[PDB]
A and B are shown apart, each in its own frame.
Chain A
Amino acid sequence: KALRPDMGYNTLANFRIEKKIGRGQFSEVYRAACLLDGVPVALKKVQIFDLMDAKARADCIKEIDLLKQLNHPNVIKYYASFIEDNELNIVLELADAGDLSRMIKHFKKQKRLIPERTVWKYFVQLCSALEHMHSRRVMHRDIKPANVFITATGVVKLGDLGTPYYMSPERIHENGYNFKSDIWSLGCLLYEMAALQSPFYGDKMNLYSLCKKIEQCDYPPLPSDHYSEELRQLVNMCINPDPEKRPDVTYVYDVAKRMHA
């Protein structure tokens, strides 16, 4: 037929969807191929029309215009951000083999769980990325294993920022999203990597029960006889109801570095 003209870098005709990498409630991600360039990227589409109040989507596009300039070895590369097919179109780097969401499920098959050395090696890079973006006042909206990607070389790439996977203490009793909310999400991610599961799993799947669980900050401590004391306490500090109780991004990055050494 007549594909859309392949003139610019912002058009669906310039992309060939090899398959659907995943389908989240907020976005659908496909393994696209830039016809004009010729590289496999990730095309994420969100139905803006549904949750389009016209007061958030415009600012979202304006801010996501800043993101390609975000050049860090441990952060997903932002290629394109446009509107087409009555929905958004975001072109990013593709890391299929590296997806903590699938890695945790695969490891849960085996009785033995992940090693402290590997988790530290990934966590140092995660802290580096978080500190690099925070120093520019930019934050990761949602940090989760499903949105943290790695590569064959061993590098950890932070996925595209989006009930969320992790409910911040500031989200509960909603007052805002502080720099320490990212610290809380990162600590919960550390716990998830450590135990193959988030620190707020249980039979009682009701919102009030889990909200009070977060408020009381009660979780099954990570296995002491397989994980380190300093790491088990760092996760505890990062997971705290008090905003300032959570250590700062630079602090967590420095401790991560001194442990990776």
Chain B
Amino acid sequence: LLAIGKTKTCESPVSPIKMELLFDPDDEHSEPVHTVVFQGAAGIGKTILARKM
């Protein structure tokens, strides 16, 4: 909250998640997930992302 308010402009790269393998199992020999829950602030892109998918 506070930093992003200030500028949050510092170099803070992260590891991104992809979209095609959102339902794939965590490991490689487990069971695939059967529910995902997108959550975000109000008007942040939930519906547009659903339409894009």
A/B contact in complex, CB under 8 angstroms: no
**Which chain B residues have a beta carbon within 8 Å of chain A's beta carbons?**
none
**Which chain A residues have a beta carbon within 8 Å of chain B's beta carbons?**
none
